[PDB]
């Protein structure tokens, strides 16, 4: 399944993910593609920060959804 | 009942609806007026994107409420 991530630079990257992929796997894919360590990633969708231990389907993230990458913190668990 | 739908360009669409109408039904009514396919519509109310499958009543949308229409590229 393709999803989009708006990166720190304002560019957008495409990820190929499982329909219920784990948030940790999504961050691992962002690290590989964009280079940001998962610990430094904060991902936002629908006004909510995405949590490790959850999956894309927990957030109703579907094909061609767009996530927003922001620097962690200062949230920031 | 009547509800209002405001575009980002500041036009107000008036719709006749019932609480039991689904969000998809509402998008169809917007298509009748505006020509915009439901797949290109996002409706926002009280801070939340309204999901296809749910009803107006699910979101406590009462008479005279204003929804906000935001366009999207059709999802493939």
């Amino acid at each position: 399944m393709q999803i989009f991530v708006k990166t720190l630079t304002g560019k957008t990257i495409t990820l190929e993910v499982e329909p219920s992929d784990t948030i940790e796997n999504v961050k691992a894919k962002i690290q590989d593609k964009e280079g940001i360590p998962p610990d430094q990633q904060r991902l936002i969708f629908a006004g909510k920060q995405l949590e490790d231990g959850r999956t894309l389907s927990d957030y109703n993230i579907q094909k061609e959804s767009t996530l927003h990458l922001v620097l962690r913190l200062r949230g920031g668990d | 009942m009547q509800i209002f739908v405001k575009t980002l360009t500041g036009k107000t669409i008036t719709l006749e609806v019932e609480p039991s109408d689904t969000i998809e039904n509402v998008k169809a009514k917007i298509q009748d007026k505006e020509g915009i396919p439901p797949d290109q519509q996002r409706l926002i109310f009280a801070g939340k994107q309204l999901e296809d499958g749910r009803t107006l009543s699910d979101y406590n949308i009462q008479r005279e409420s204003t929804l906000h229409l935001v366009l999207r590229l059709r999802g493939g």
């Binding site: 936002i44 927003h68 922001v70 | 926002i44 994107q49």
Partner: peptide, 29 residues
């Protein structure tokens, strides 16, 4: 700070975002 409603579309946005996730309007004017 606090989650913030977009002035245009009302979307309740995460405080880490400077523009609305739905309609791309900046938070403040």
């Amino acid at each position: 700070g606090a989650p913030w409603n977009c002035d245009s579309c009302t979307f309740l946005n995460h405080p880490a975002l400077n523009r609305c996730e739905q309609c791309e309007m900046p938070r403040y004017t």
